[PDB]
């Protein structure tokens, strides 16, 4: 596919949302032919660097957030991957990334226990005009009864000013995690749960 021309034009306008939507519409020619290809290789030229990163917007983040609900992986490639001197480093990186994005598993934890689920919660800052916004999301890296292993993240959710999940929100996200683990292991309880939080646990949160 070819990037539609107006993207270049909006590159002058410095509108990140418009550029991301135009890129999605450029890839829209690949929506019907999802079976033909496994991984898409979106390339963002250095000339688009003005919209690469600016306050309140992340170009790769927005692109992947737009493409994920459509269920087609992308491995965004910028000039960095080309620039980078050591070729073997980048080649290992891209090769492993593409193989794992296709659906394969390059490697797995040896002798990993399938009855333990390792939860991990993190957060991010959105600089609101009036206050701040804390976005908290969880991730799981458990190993199902099969041979492959799973790795899934999800939002913890309406508005949060502090990164500490309350009783309701934390019990909800942990119940969702428990259902996720149950779905893979036929319904067996996780005999041990690990939770890695970047900040301390509150009394109510425990």
């Amino acid at each position: 596919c070819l990037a539609l021309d107006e993207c270049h034009g909006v590159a002058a306008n410095g509108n990140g949302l418009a550029l991301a939507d135009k890129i999605v519409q450029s890839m829209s020619g690949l929506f019907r032919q999802k079976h033909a290809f496994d991984v898409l290789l979106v390339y963002l030229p250095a000339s688009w660097k003005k919209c690469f990163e600016y306050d309140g917007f992340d170009l790769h983040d927005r692109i992947k957030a737009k493409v994920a609900p459509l269920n087609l992986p992308i491995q965004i490639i910028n000039d960095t991957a080309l620039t980078r001197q050591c070729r073997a480093n980048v080649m290992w990186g891209v090769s492993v990334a593409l193989y794992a994005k296709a659906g394969g598993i390059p490697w797995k934890l040896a002798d990993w226990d399938k009855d333990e689920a390792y939860i991990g919660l993190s957060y991010a800052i959105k600089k609101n005009a009036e206050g701040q916004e804390y976005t908290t999301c969880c991730s799981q890296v458990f190993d199902p009864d099969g041979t492959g292993f799973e790795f899934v993240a999800y939002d913890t959710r309406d508005r949060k000013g502090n990164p500490y999940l309350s009783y309701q929100e934390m019990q909800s996200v942990l119940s969702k995690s428990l259902h996720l683990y149950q779905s893979s292991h036929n319904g067996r309880m996780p005999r041990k749960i690990f939770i890695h939080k970047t900040t301390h646990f509150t009394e109510d949160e425990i």
């Binding site: 992947k64 957030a65 992986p73 991010a124 999301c137 991730s139």
Partner: protein, 52 residues
């Protein structure tokens, strides 16, 4: 300690030996950035192969 040490080795996006944090922490951070940028993702859970 062993769980975290082993978890810092299964980041496929990373092409080096290990990381500073378990893959749970780094992927939760990445998805936190993704959700913060785009509020209309909160409904569904996503695999690591999309955002890695």
């Amino acid at each position: 300690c062993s769980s975290i040490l082993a978890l810092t080795k299964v980041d496929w996006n990373n092409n080096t030996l290990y990381k500073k944090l378990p893959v749970t922490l780094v992927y939760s951070q990445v998805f936190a950035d993704v959700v913060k940028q785009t509020p209309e993702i909160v409904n569904e859970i996503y695999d690591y192969r999309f955002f890695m």
